[PDB]
Design a protein around this ligand. Structure first.
Ligand SMILES: [Hg+2]
Ligand SMILES: [Hg+2]
Ligand SMILES: [Hg+2]
Length: 739
């Protein structure tokens, strides 16, 4: 990342920026005047797309609304760029003749769309019924345009000499080569005078040194942005995708920023899922290695984030007095650089990932390898847990350093789609695939909270009601079974280390190919890896075995103390709020109470959904996932969240988390009440403040989708309409990216 502190970088992103003329954009976004494009305030050749909410005379948004003309234009233009890229790099002649013919067909398709789709029927309203006459008119235009788009795209394939698949591939290719920052600004319900809220996606791509060499490039380059053009196209490809830093907060009238949320959208599936088709056990193990390789990239990017969450004073405070230079250089940038190098050099770095996955692992129809997406990622996160990864930290624009970073994994996987929790004996999904890991994960998180309790609550007994919650939340004594688990988890470390290095070696060989193979060493390498994995699986089973015991006891404990736990939570609020709102109470004191309560509230509400097994009911659809992500963000972990491509399910999770973080941060209190999750959206002409905030959240999603696919979207199939303000119509536009 730019090695500037993230708060200052966000500050600048919300500045007066330089506009970018259409012909210089990296991508067509359409909706002119709404989706405004600008130069990045800090990085040369980087761009920013910003949307400001506008509203109609009724207070209903006019921005973030699907318009099929605009989407038709987006699709035409984005496919034309893929086409011209393919024809430029191809062997066949008559390049210009073909490119100009493509242009010519794009002009003709745009004009014909505009003569055939009336504007008064081209736009949808998200916040109304899909069955309104006006929305039925939008659907009808959409089906028309879809028809024109298959014609246009057929004609493009014919003219360009490339197939549908290759055009699509090249499309994803050039878009993720120069990704834009995306910003949505709006005043949330009850915003203060001259203040505004915001949500941004800032792309994160750094390539570990291991990825740089394997992707054909060379290790020595400090700047290691995502690049497939210098790659040699063996089927496997390295690097995470659809990953962005997600920041939400408020902007004060003076232009300063309070950050209310800071996590990752994505990454997507952490392996190359398409490679799965027709794969032998050799190609499968190789896929598992790509996932490992990708996991160290995640580790690298979490450490980079820790750094950018630190001010210069923070780094200074953390360099022992005797290593500090007498003089810090005049150049503000060369000072941060030195500050980062000294910090890293003198401090063990450790990072914790909380990955809330929202695929349905057990699904047996339209599976799309959701099983390996759970399994390979949980494997590889754990292969790294409680050890150290060699990594690179960018310190300046042409400087960097190498450190080990301590890593710690927490992974959970609760589905969100129609197959999330099938009935007894239903063969459409196997609900049991994630049972063990989710148990393990709930124990891990609830122990993390206990340890936090023993640490903080010990020293803040001015607040009696906080003591009593602590006692209750300690749960059943499970110290023995936990000891057993940490003993067996320590035993695994050396095998995991052997496993990781052996797998890495396996991919170096396999990545050569037929005319290049040395079969004897391949087979040898496969074999060592398998033995290590057999043995790891074996110990993983006894560890789960122990977790399931703790789970059993925790439940019994919960089912019987639920009432007291809530009473005790209520009573902490009741004593805690009026201190928080006292204007004489200092900021750091306020933080502490808020964190202590919010943390406990998240945990307990998660417990109810998990222990009563209600997380999967329609009315509770993303709540448990949101509650754990939220909790992990309180415990100051990096929360990664995902579906397969992260355009659909993972975006709806991000909406529920960002929207909650925004709702909560803007309370009198800053204390979580759950209204933003519990409130039943009604889609009416008059809605609540929570629903009004909800209306806002699909816009960054349409932008994000456009940047991934060429077209707006999110096509998540809503399970309970009362969970979301919008009616899913961006989903029908999202279908343009299939055709
Ligand atoms: Hg990233
Ligand atoms: Hg707590
Ligand atoms: Hg948080």
């Amino acid at each position: 990342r730019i090695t500037e502190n993230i708060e200052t970088y966000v500050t600048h992103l919300l500045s007066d920026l330089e506009p970018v003329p259409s012909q210089n954009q990296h991508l067509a976004y359409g909706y002119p005047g709404e989706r405004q494009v600008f130069k990045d305030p800090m990085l040369d050749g980087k761009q920013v797309v910003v949307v400001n909410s506008q509203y109609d005379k009724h207070g209903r948004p006019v921005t973030g609304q699907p318009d099929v003309i605009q989407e038709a234009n987006n699709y035409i233009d984005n496919l034309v760029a893929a086409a011209k890229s393919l024809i430029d790099k191809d062997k066949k002649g008559e390049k210009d003749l073909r490119k100009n013919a493509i242009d010519e067909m794009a002009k003709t398709f745009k004009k014909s769309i505009s003569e055939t789709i009336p504007s008064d029927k081209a736009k949808a309203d998200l916040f109304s019924s899909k069955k309104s006459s006006a929305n039925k008119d939008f659907l009808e235009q959409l089906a028309k345009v879809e028809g024109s788009l298959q014609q246009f795209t057929q004609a493009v394939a014919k003219a360009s000499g490339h197939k549908l698949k290759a055009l699509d591939k090249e499309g994803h290719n050039i878009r993720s080569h120069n990704r834009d920052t995306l910003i949505h600004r709006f005043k949330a319900p009850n915003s203060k005078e001259g203040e505004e809220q915001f949500i941004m996606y800032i792309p994160c791509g750094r390539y570990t040194k291991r990825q740089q060499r394997l992707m054909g490039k060379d290790e020595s380059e400090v700047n290691r942005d995502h690049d497939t053009t210098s790659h040699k196209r063996s089927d496997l490809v390295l690097g995470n995708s659809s990953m962005a830093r997600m920041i939400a907060g408020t902007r004060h009238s003076d232009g300063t920023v309070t950050i209310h949320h800071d996590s990752f959208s994505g990454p997507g599936a952490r392996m190359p899922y398409s490679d799965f088709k027709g794969a032998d056990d050799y190609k499968k193990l190789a896929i598992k290695a790509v996932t490992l390789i990708n996991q160290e990239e995640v580790i690298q990017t979490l450490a980079q984030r820790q750094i950018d969450r630190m001010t210069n004073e923070d780094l200074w405070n953390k360099i022992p007095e005797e290593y500090r230079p007498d003089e810090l250089p005049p150049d503000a940038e060369k000072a941060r650089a030195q500050l980062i190098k000294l910090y890293v050099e003198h401090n063990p770095l450790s990072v914790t990932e909380c990955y809330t996955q929202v695929v349905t692992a057990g699904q047996r129809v339209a599976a799309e390898n959701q099983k390996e997406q759970f399994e390979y990622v949980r494997q590889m996160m754990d292969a790294f847990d409680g050890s150290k990864a060699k990594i690179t930290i960018q310190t300046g624009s042409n400087t960097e350093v190498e450190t080990a970073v301590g890593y710690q994994a927490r992974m959970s996987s609760w589905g969100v789609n129609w197959f999330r929790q099938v009935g007894a004996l239903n063969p459409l999904s196997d609900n049991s695939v994630t049972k063990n890991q989710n148990a393990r994960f709930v124990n891990q998180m609830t122990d993390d909270v206990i340890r936090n309790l023993d640490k903080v609550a010990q020293n803040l007994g001015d607040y009696d009601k906080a003591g009593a919650l602590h006692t209750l939340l300690k749960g059943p004594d499970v110290s023995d079974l936990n000891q057993q688990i940490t003993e067996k988890e320590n035993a695994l470390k050396e095998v995991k280390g052997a496993y990781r290095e052996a797998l890495f070696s396996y991919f170096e060989e396999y990545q050569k190919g037929e005319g290049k193979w040395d079969q004897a060493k391949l087979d040898q390498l496969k074999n060592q890896v398998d033995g290590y994995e057999k043995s790891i699986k074996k110990q993983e089973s006894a560890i789960y075995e122990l977790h399931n015991q703790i789970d059993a006891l925790r439940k019994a404990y919960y089912t019987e103390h639920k009432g007291q736990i809530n009473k005790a939570l209520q009573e902490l609020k009741e004593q805690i709020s009026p201190v928080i709102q006292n204007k004489e109470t200092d900021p750091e004191t306020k933080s502490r109470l808020q964190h202590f309560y919010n943390s406990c509230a998240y945990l307990t509400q998660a417990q109810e959904l998990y222990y009563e097994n209600t997380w999967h009911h329609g009315k509770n659809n993303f709540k448990l996932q949101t509650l754990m992500a939220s909790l992990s963000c309180e415990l100051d972990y990096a929360n990664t969240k995902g579906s397969k491509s992260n355009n659909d399910r993972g975006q709806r999770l991000a909406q529920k988390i960002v929207g909650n973080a925004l709702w909560t941060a803007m309370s009198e209190d800053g204390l979580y009440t759950g209204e933003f999750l519990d409130h039943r959206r009604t889609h009416g002409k008059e809605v609540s403040n929570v629903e009004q905030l909800d209306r806002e959240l699909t816009t960054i999603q349409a932008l994000h989708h456009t940047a991934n696919t060429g077209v707006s979207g999110g096509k998540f199939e809503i399970q309970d309409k009362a969970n979301f303000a919008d009616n899913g119509l961006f989903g029908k536009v999202a279908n343009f990216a299939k055709i």
